[PDB]
Amino acid sequence: TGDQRFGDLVFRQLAPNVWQHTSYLDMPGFGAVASNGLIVRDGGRVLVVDTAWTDDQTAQILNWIKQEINLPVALAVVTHAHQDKMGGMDALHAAGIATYANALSNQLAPQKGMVAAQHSLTFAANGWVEPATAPNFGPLKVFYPGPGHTSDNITVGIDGTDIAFGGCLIKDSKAKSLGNLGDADTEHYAASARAFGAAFPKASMIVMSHSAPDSRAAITHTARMADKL
Ligand SMILES: [Cl-]
């Protein structure tokens, strides 16, 4: 499917069954902020990681899925309670899609003027999602690395691929900053970035919220910036 413009979004194929979705927030005076999530074809169903910034943009994701894949969307997982990741929850719910987030994300969501997911994930002491809370996730491997970008940030690996999703936790290997630290846990950030690397040690493609996918150098670089906080 390549790189493709569809509506106001960009879709980029990462692997035979994995695509990155990109949507943009206009901040009047400063132009457009990209946010990336994922689309996974898991057999005869589709799995979404993160919404777009808005309901309309998130409906465009669903329309692209219908046009390009023509398989039903079984579920979505959202990686923390900010607008770039949970802005479009209502569009998923209107389409009848089961939604999942960290229990703490669902507690924070309404306080940040957003809609909670339907289901709450909980995590073992080692950071892996408790399987009873993540029924039928298939290849999606969900990990809580500890607080960093936010207290609630979660991360996802895709079994059967070399791909892991750091979302807003991880920055690219040439980044000059850690991005948006408005809600960050600066004391815990470095260890949480390293914990994400340790959870997905065979990943060679690191997908993140506001940069193109990178090597494992993204993880090291992120942790080293966070060591200076
Ligand atoms: Cl960020």
Ligand SMILES: [Cl-]
């Ligand atoms: Cl791995």
Ligand SMILES: [Cl-]
């Ligand atoms: Cl980024």
Ligand SMILES: [Zn+2]
């Ligand atoms: Zn965020």
Ligand SMILES: [Zn+2]
């Ligand atoms: Zn971000």
